[PDB]
Amino acid sequence: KRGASSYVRETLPVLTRTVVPADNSCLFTSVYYVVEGGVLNPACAPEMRRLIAQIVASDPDFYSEAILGKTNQEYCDWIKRDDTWGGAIEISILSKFYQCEICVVDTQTVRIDRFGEDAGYTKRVLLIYDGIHYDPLQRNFPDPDTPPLTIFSSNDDIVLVQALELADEARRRRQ
Amino acid sequence: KRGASSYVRETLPVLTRTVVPADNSCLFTSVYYVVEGGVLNPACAPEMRRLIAQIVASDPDFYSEAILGKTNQEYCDWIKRDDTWGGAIEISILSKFYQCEICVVDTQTVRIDRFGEDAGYTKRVLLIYDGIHYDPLQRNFPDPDTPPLTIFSSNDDIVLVQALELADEARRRRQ
């Protein structure tokens, strides 16, 4: 029969995805979810786009065509549209605003893209990206009381270890 | 446009499954794969079953009905059949024989079952189990030269962190 006495069971916290709506707002909704401590607000994008436009218009010395791929005013008009999709340029701006490292695991390349890698921020948050859609990641614990965590120490590299595994498994399921 | 300059890419080694045949030999084939350094030998089971029977018959003081769920002779006849499936009793015996901790991640319970947890072995190997089929796990590296690794230090808990993630993702895909 079974053998239940011949081993010691172990468990640890794991990272899990929380799914946000599959629309062009997903970057903004995912970022809000993790910097807010794990709370979905599907209406956050217009305020976040306005914030990004304010930041970019206020620093044209930095935010030029070479960075934005559009003129500074053209970019600001563009980010304020309700139909545009966010990406790396906006994640970099939001990382600086929130003063938080944003680590995006990419399931197409099995790599983490770290925004704020050298900034000395004390916290990091994680998203997962498949080339079109972003979702937020959180740490779930193996106990019934601890709520999920979305904001990590920037010295916590366990989350990076686990995120990469999740990306690798996703890319293998895709293949 | 794209934003490729605004982040630092990072990667790390990840654990991956190597698939062994979907038949009743899978425990034995998976164990051979990892203790042999990552080599599939689909013909290993008869020799491994004979070894287990020899070990059990040689220590009836320990290997009684309370451990085996059969009489010692009934167990030895049973393990030598070519149609029987291995499980925890056999993993515990093989862990002692190989002097290696065998860590089975269970995708039904999202837990690692550690055989040899307190034995002071200096190496560990990992399998993944879904309630019926075992496959071996290995560490693959993000470079073209390092071959995959199946035998870890028993102080390497990164492999446990990553295995649990893989189990969690498997149980969520099942649901």
Query: Domain total for chain A?
Result: 1
Q: How far is B106 from chain A (nearest CA, A)?
A: 10
Residue B132 labeled ligand binder: yes
Q: Return the sign of the alpha-carbon dihedral for residues B151, B159, B39, B35.
A: positive
Q: Find the closest chain B residue to A78 by CA distance.
A: B1
Backbone phi, psi, residue B83, to 5°: -110, 5
Write the burial class of residue B84 (CB in 10 Å: 0-12 exposed, 13-18 middle, 19+ buried): middle
Helix ranges restricted to H, A4-137: 26-35, 45-57, 65-68, 72-79, 88-98
- What is the experimental resolution, given in Å to one decimal place? 1.5
Backbone phi, psi, residue B150, to 5°: -110, -10
Amino acid identity for residue A69 in this structure: G
Write the burial class of residue B44 (CB in 10 Å: 0-12 exposed, 13-18 middle, 19+ buried): middle
Chain B stretch 73-112, residues whose beta carbon is closer than 8 A to a beta carbon of chain A? 87-89, 91-92, 104, 109-112
State the CATH number of the domain containing residue B153: 3.90.70.80
Question: What are the chain A neighbours of B160 within 8 Å (beta carbons)?
Answer: 10, 12
Would you state the structure tokens that stand for residue A102, as one six-digit string?
């944003």
Q: How many other β-carbons are positioned within 10 Å of the β-carbon of residue A164?
A: 24
In our burial notation (b when 16+ CB lie closer than 10 A, e otherwise), range B62-73 reads ebeeebbebebe
Range of the domain at B161: 1-175
In the PDB record, what is the listed experimental method?
A: X-ray
The distance of Cα A37 from the centroid of its chain, to the nearest Å, equals 12
Q: Is B18 on the interface with A (CB under 8 A)?
A: no
Would you state the structure tokens that stand for residue A54, as one six-digit string?
């304010």
**How far apart, in whole angstroms, are the C-alpha atoms of residue A108 and residue A125?**
20
- Does residue A157 carry a catalytic annotation? no
